[PDB]
Amino acid sequence: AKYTGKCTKSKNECKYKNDAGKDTFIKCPKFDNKKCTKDNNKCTVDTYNNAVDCD
Ligand SMILES: CCOCCOCCOCCO
Ligand code: NA
Numbered sequence: 001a002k003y004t005g006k007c008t009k010s011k012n013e014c015k016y017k018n019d020a021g022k023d024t025f026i027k028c029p030k031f032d033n034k035k036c037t038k039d040n041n042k043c044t045v046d047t048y049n050n051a052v053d054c055d
Contacts, residue, residue, distance in 0.1 A: 001047040007036030007054040014043035014052050028054035 005016030012028045012035055026045055028036045029052060034055040038044065043054035 003007070003047065004044045005043045005045060005055040007039075007041050009036050009039045012036050014045055014054050016043070016045050026052055028052055032055075 001015040003018070005014045007014045007028055011025075012026055012030075013025045014036070015023055015025050018024050024028060028034060034053045038055075041055040043052060044051050
């Protein structure tokens with residue numbers, strides 16, 4: 001169950017619209033390769049594994 005969203009740099013968060021059409025925010029990791037490095041970069045959310053990867 002995979003989603004693409006957009007991340008924000010200040011809050012280091014991923015915003016994705018879930019299957020119900022509801023916008024949901026979830027934290028990006030602190031790790032270098034998974035943090036949001038720029039506003040409006042892509043991010044992915046795997047709700048099966050509950051894993052977030054921001055760019
Ligand atoms: C606001 C939530 O704070 C949780 C702090 O716990 C530290 C654990 O590190 C994060 C592991 O994914
Ligand atoms: Na990334």
